[PDB]
Amino acid sequence: MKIYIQPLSVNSHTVEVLANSLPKIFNAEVFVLPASDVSLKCYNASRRQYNSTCILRMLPPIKVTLGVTGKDIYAKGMNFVFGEAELGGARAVLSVFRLTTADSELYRERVVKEAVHEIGHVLGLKHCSNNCVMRFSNSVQDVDRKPVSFCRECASKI
Ligand SMILES: [Zn+2]
Ligand SMILES: [Zn+2]
């Protein structure tokens, strides 16, 4: 397994956080692609947010590719989403916009958790109701409450 991180209008510190943590978590080689701007094609001026599905569909469909953006994103019927993944597919996107915080260590943990979550989906995992990174999070407060680790059931499936 290899993971390709596509920076899209996100600071380089956030990228380095994922580059350094993902490899051990997934026993995969991680590659950072040249940064680029998130495409204005995906911008929704009315909402001042980018559409997560539109961003996802512009990434190369190469398992596993994770786009990471600093911009706030939404999906159809959602105020906002933290991200979006192709379940059992190739691509996912993560926005760190809703995750920002002046507590640098907390921010690091949130970024890693939600990246791990999205990649879990790419690897075929659905939402989990155990104490598990694959738990759905309604808000960042919920992100803070779930662990960065897969429960024994989810770990056995990947
Ligand atoms: Zn999810
Ligand atoms: Zn689980």
Residue numbers in the entry: 1 to 158
Question: What did the published study say regarding this structure?
Answer:
Archaemetzincins are metalloproteases occurring in archaea and some mammalia. They are distinct from all the other metzincins by their extended active site consensus sequence HEXXHXXGXXHCX4CXMX17CXXC featuring four conserved cysteine residues. The overall structure of AfAmzA resembles those of other metzincins, consisting of an upper N-terminal domain (NTD) and a lower helical C-terminal domain (CTD) with respect to the active site helix α2, which harbors two of the three zinc-binding histidines (H117EIGH121) and the catalytic base Glu118. On the other hand, as the homologous archaemetzincins from Methanopyrus kandleri (MkAmzA) and Methanocorpusculum labreanum (MlAmzA), AfAmzA exhibits a second zinc-binding site located in the CTD immediately below the catalytic zinc binding site and close to the eponymous, structurally important Met-turn.
Consequently, two different crystal forms are observed, one triclinic and one hexagonal. In the nat-AfAmzA::citrate complex the catalytic zinc ion is penta-coordinated in a either slightly distorted square pyramidal or a bidentate tetrahedral geometry by three histidine imidazoles as well as by the carbonyl oxygen (Oβ1) and hydroxyl oxygen (OHβ) of citrate, with ligand-metal distances of 2.0–2.2 Å. The catalytic water molecule is completely excluded from the zinc environment. In the case of citrate as zinc ligand, the S1′-wall forming segment has to move to avoid steric clashes with the pro-S -CH2-COO- branch of the ligand. Besides acting as zinc ligands, these carboxylic acids also mediate a new crystal contact consisting of a salt bridge between one of their carboxylate groups and Arg152 of a symmetry-related molecule. As a consequence, significant differences are observed between NHis-AfAmzA and the two carboxylate-coordinated nat-AfAmzA crystal forms. On the other hand, we detect upon ligand binding opening of the active site at the S' sites.
